[PDB]
Amino acid sequence: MSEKKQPVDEDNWDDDNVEDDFSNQLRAELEKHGYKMETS
Amino acid sequence: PKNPDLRIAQLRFLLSLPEHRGDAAVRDELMAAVRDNNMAPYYEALCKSLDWQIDVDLLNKMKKANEDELKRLDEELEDAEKNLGESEIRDAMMAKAEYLCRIGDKEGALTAFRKTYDKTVALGHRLDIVFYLLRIGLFYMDNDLITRNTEKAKSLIEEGGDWDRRNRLKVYQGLYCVAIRDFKQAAELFLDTVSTFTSYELMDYKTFVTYTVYVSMIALERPDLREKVIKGAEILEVLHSLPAVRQYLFSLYECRYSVFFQSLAVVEQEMKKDWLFAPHYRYYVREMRIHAYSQLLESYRSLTLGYMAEAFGVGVEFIDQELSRFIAAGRLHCKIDKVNEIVETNRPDSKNWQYQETIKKGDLLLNRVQKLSRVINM
Amino acid sequence: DLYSRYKKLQQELEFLEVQEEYIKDEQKNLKK
Amino acid sequence: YLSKIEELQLIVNDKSQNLRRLQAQRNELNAKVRL
Amino acid sequence: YLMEGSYNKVFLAKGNIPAESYTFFIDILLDTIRDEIAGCIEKAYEKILFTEATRILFFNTPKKMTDYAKKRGWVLGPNNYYSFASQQQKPEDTTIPSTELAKQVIEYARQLEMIV
Amino acid sequence: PPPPPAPQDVEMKEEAATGGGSTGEADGKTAAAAAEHSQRELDTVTLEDIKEHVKQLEKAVSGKEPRFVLRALRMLPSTSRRLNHYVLYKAVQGFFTSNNATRDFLLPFLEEPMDTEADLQFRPRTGKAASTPLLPEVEAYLQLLVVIFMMNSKRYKEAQKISDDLMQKISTQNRRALDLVAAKCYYYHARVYEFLDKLDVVRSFLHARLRTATLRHDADGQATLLNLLLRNYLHYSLYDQAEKLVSKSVFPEQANNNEWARYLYYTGRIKAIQLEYSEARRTMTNALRKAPQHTAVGFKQTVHKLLIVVELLLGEIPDRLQFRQPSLKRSLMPYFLLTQAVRTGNLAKFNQVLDQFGEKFQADGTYTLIIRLRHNVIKTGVRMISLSYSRISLADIAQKLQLDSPEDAEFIVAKAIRDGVIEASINHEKGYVQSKEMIDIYSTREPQLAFHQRISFCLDIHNMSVKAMRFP
């Protein structure tokens, strides 16, 4: 049923969602999440 | 007439991402409002920045002066059109009225862009169209502007076109291909570095040097790496003033990994603080890292992590989630053990997938046009 | 007309069985 | 009504006129290629 | 919770499982514990000892687990347990995978014929 | 009055090629199917489903069905003048006043071309005469003096079953026209009979209607009536699904090429809801790649919201955002977040999404998802980590994935061996898995073992091309 205005108009997906869930996060960030140990 | 307004892109991004300096944008961009008669830095910053306790009459007397310049434009345009000039007064009003779009909002656009849109008669009367919409499409998050005016320039401006300004189109399209993560087209579109010293579109050539290095650290193959950063010296000296960048590239040619962490973390600090990346730099770092890891895996086969923790630090359980997710990201073709600690390099092409892809196409393709081969029947 | 309604289409079935067999033989000659 | 069934069901089987139509066409084709 | 991996959720459930004579069925539930132990006591395992027959099996030692040591062809090691000496019974299955594939070449090569 | 000339025109173009055209393609034709105006007329049925059909309103009421139902006569060649009688009555809508003679006066009108004369011999004129007026009526189900006339008009279509099994003193092959209609309209049967309640004797209508298309006309009946039976047992509870398990005769020439697609989708839902992962998801895959076009919005979108649920139960599923219509986005707000809860190993999220949208999961109505979806969490975790490390300990995976004890982790390893993912043993003292990955497994003969099926499959498709060459 196409009766409207319209007739002119796991790989890495489930991971593109979790990878778009932590979007500004610290998934990796070694020199940050790894050397906060011996800074103090 | 674009470069302080490209700083306005810099400074609306300064408004956007860094809330550490939650009002730097009103400082140097309201400093850019009291000069240049720019009334935008309290229009959009009235909408997006702070509550504006009192800057009203101090900037509306200059919105009145904006009206005075605007109405001597609105008297110069018809008091100058008495002369028989083909789009010449139209050029006089689109320069200072597209400059009113620089001064003001998209009202300056609709009185500027759509007005000088139709009776474009020459090349600069379309070069300023496409460029002077590429500016505002770049300043905002707009995509139809910066893509489709350049589509017009591919149609209208060229007919083969100038060698120079079409390379300038390659520069703007390279800015979109670094806005989106289009790796081969960013670095490939940044190949010349000849005709782009410092134009009125280029507020910093060294930012262009960052723009080509930040993608030639991904898309560039290793013989292509020595072909660019070693066989080509024309970019070397303007990054010879950036010796940590040059160190990161030669280290990248060497695979020493602690300075990867250092200067890649610095590149990440810039990557936070630079626009056209924020929707995109999540993909960046770890891909960077696997761009290092694979040749690391090309080092040899039965690797231990302590030899890696020499270059990693405490990369023991770091590489647990890191490497286990990189395997789990469909990448990093290997196997890993805890105590016997086998690392694997393999993936011999002439194995299965080269044998696979053709029927991967020719099954949905086969049923697809086979399905098209039955619409003739019933 | 079920007397010879049933029978007559078989008479016009045997022969095209024979040439249905036989076109492969003639094409087999045209290979030669 | 008894054997009023099967003869039209043999007229179903006159696709051999169509498949052997293609074979008769083909006989003409390669026969006249030979000629 | 059975197919989650708790055979002790059985004994937590049987605290209140009468349920208008749901006693025969929980006895057959104990049966479908014990014969699946008769499957899963050494499935891909190295070995077990008596205390694993105290944990997974119950009722310490009947002659039913002694039967389990004497029903399935079992090596009752000295406080030790083995399915066999090899548990897998020497898998090579043909030592010749080639000639039957030449039979695949017989009918398959015939299938390449008769068509074009 | 200027728009009703368009149904005036397209109506006459329908029964021209259809009536005179397909009747002329039905007199002596159709060694298999020379009636191309059958499929053309069905394309005009799709045209009447895209457009308004003829006279649902059309700025008037009830014009064409009192007009064109008369006077065919099938007589001496001045019956093109009867078509001229059909054409020259169009000054009633244009010049005169239009009047109400549908849904109440159709009851003798359906008798009228039969009461003009003993009109003609072939039943597609009769099923045309009880379909092409009456199928414009079935799509106005405002349940007020319109569904009882769908009801009764399809009782006349039950008299088209009666005038289908008892016409041409048996075996003129007009089912290859009429089942071409008796596919579509019979679905409308199970629409309107299920616009109100479940149908229970139309089950039997469907049963004997399946039995009449058994062998004498095994053409377009058995698969479409098979769909009606399948969606009957599907809309109803799960009791009669052993039918195909014992009477697996579900294989026509698969002519309609969408019937076979969504049909294999439907039995995909069947084997899905019984218990199946692999065969279920690969006919989800096969019906998915046999989804025809994007020419109907939503009907792939919601059905594909239901398609990948077994793949949600695999644990290896990607998130459908390129499938996502933004109109489906507001309806996949639980569902985006559902597969978000799938790939996240959280438990409070696992019961929090179920807690949040159990009503939309009732709209799903397939709560076999939740009985094995926690199981799918532990299988995804053990698949990922068992895939990662050769010799992990069970304490490593266990108190990371909150298992709190070694022995239920030994039960996870036990039922993972039983489910056969990895050959992980245990350094059997108290747990503490000793194990392996599996590479250097084999790579050379084993692919060319599969190439027997690749290329025997290829020669299958080869002879599909030779038999495809048998068509002209």
Swiss-Prot record, chain A:
- Where is the protein found, in the record's own terms? Nucleus
InterPro entries (UniProt xref): DSS1_SEM1 (IPR007834)
Tell me the keywords, alphabetical order.
Nucleus, Proteasome
Tissue specificity field: Expressed in limb bud, craniofacial primordia and skin.
Task: Name the major location.
Answer: nucleus
Q: Which residues form a coiled coil?
A: none
User: What residues form the membrane-spanning segments?
Assistant: none
* GO process terms (BP): double-strand break repair via homologous recombination; mRNA export from nucleus; proteasome assembly; proteasome-mediated ubiquitin-dependent protein catabolic process
Q: Known SMART domains for this protein?
A: DSS1_SEM1
Cellular component GO terms held in the UniProt record: cytosol; integrator complex; nucleoplasm; proteasome complex; proteasome regulatory particle, lid subcomplex; protein-containing complex
What PANTHER family does the record tag this protein with?
26 PROTEASOME COMPLEX SUBUNIT DSS1 (PTHR16771), 26S PROTEASOME COMPLEX SUBUNIT SEM1 (PTHR16771:SF0)
Q: What does this protein do?
A: Component of the 26S proteasome, a multiprotein complex involved in the ATP-dependent degradation of ubiquitinated proteins. This complex plays a key role in the maintenance of protein homeostasis by removing misfolded or damaged proteins, which could impair cellular functions, and by removing proteins whose functions are no longer required. Therefore, the proteasome participates in numerous cellular processes, including cell cycle progression, apoptosis, or DNA damage repair.
The UniProt family comment states: Belongs to the DSS1/SEM1 family.
Recorded protein name is 26S proteasome complex subunit SEM1
Naturally occurring in which organism (per UniProt)? Homo sapiens
Task: Write the gene name.
Answer: SEM1
Swiss-Prot record, chain B:
Mind telling me which GO cellular component terms the entry cites?
cytosol; extracellular region; ficolin-1-rich granule lumen; nucleoplasm; proteasome accessory complex; proteasome complex; proteasome regulatory particle; secretory granule lumen
Q: Which UniProt keywords apply?
A: Proteasome
Annotated PCI domain ranges read 182-350
By its UniProt entry, which InterPro entries does this protein fall under?
Answer: PCI_dom, Rpn7/CSN1, Rpn7_N, RPN7_PSMD6_C, TPR-like_helical_dom_sf, WH_DNA-bd_sf
Source taxon at top rank: Eukaryota
What SMART domains is this protein classified in? Answer: PINT
Which biological processes are named by the entry's GO terms? Answer: proteasome-mediated ubiquitin-dependent protein catabolic process
Q: How does it assemble?
A: Component of the 19S proteasome regulatory particle complex. The 26S proteasome consists of a 20S core particle (CP) and two 19S regulatory subunits (RP). The regulatory particle is made of a lid composed of 9 subunits including PSMD6, a base containing 6 ATPases and few additional components.
Family per record: Belongs to the proteasome subunit S10 family.
Its job: Component of the 26S proteasome, a multiprotein complex involved in the ATP-dependent degradation of ubiquitinated proteins. This complex plays a key role in the maintenance of protein homeostasis by removing misfolded or damaged proteins, which could impair cellular functions, and by removing proteins whose functions are no longer required. Therefore, the proteasome participates in numerous cellular processes, including cell cycle progression, apoptosis, or DNA damage repair.
Question: What name does UniProt use for this protein?
Answer: 26S proteasome non-ATPase regulatory subunit 6
Curated annotation (Swiss-Prot), chain C:
Residues of the signal sequence?
A: none
Q: Where is the protein situated, by its record's location annotation?
A: Cytoplasm; Nucleus
Q: How does it assemble?
A: Component of the 19S proteasome regulatory particle complex. The 26S proteasome consists of a 20S core particle (CP) and two 19S regulatory subunits (RP). The regulatory particle is made of a lid composed of 9 subunits, a base containing 6 ATPases including PSMC4 and few additional components. Interacts with NR1I3. Interacts with PAAF1. Interacts with TRIM5. Interacts with ZFAND1.
The free-text function statement in the UniProt record for this protein reads: Component of the 26S proteasome, a multiprotein complex involved in the ATP-dependent degradation of ubiquitinated proteins. This complex plays a key role in the maintenance of protein homeostasis by removing misfolded or damaged proteins, which could impair cellular functions, and by removing proteins whose functions are no longer required. Therefore, the proteasome participates in numerous cellular processes, including cell cycle progression, apoptosis, or DNA damage repair.
What family, per the record? Belongs to the AAA ATPase family.
Q: What is this protein called?
A: 26S proteasome regulatory subunit 6B
Q: Which organism is it from?
A: Homo sapiens
GN (gene name): PSMC4
Full protein: residues contained? 39 to 70 of 418
Swiss-Prot record, chain E:
Q: Superkingdom of the source?
A: Eukaryota
Give yes or no: UniProt keyword Phosphoprotein. yes
Q: Name one GO cellular component term.
A: cytosol
Cross-link Glycyl lysine isopeptide (Lys-Gly) (interchain with G-Cter in SUMO2) lies at: K63
The GO biological-process annotations, alphabetized, read as:
proteasome-mediated ubiquitin-dependent protein catabolic process
Keywords, A to Z, come to: Isopeptide bond, Phosphoprotein, Proteasome, Ubl conjugation
**Job description of the protein:** Component of the 26S proteasome, a multiprotein complex involved in the ATP-dependent degradation of ubiquitinated proteins. This complex plays a key role in the maintenance of protein homeostasis by removing misfolded or damaged proteins, which could impair cellular functions, and by removing proteins whose functions are no longer required. Therefore, the proteasome participates in numerous cellular processes, including cell cycle progression, apoptosis, or DNA damage repair.
Return the similarity comment.
Belongs to the proteasome subunit S14 family.
Q: How does it assemble?
A: Component of the 19S proteasome regulatory particle complex. The 26S proteasome consists of a 20S core particle (CP) and two 19S regulatory subunits (RP). The regulatory particle is made of a lid composed of 9 subunits including PSMD8, a base containing 6 ATPases and few additional components. Interacts with DDI2. Interacts with TASOR.
Q: What is this protein called?
A: 26S proteasome non-ATPase regulatory subunit 8
Which species is this record about?
Answer: Homo sapiens
Q: What taxonomic classification does the UniProt entry list for its organism?
A: Eukaryota, Metazoa, Chordata, Craniata, Vertebrata
Q: Which gene encodes it?
A: PSMD8
Location of this fragment in the whole protein: 235 to 350 of 350
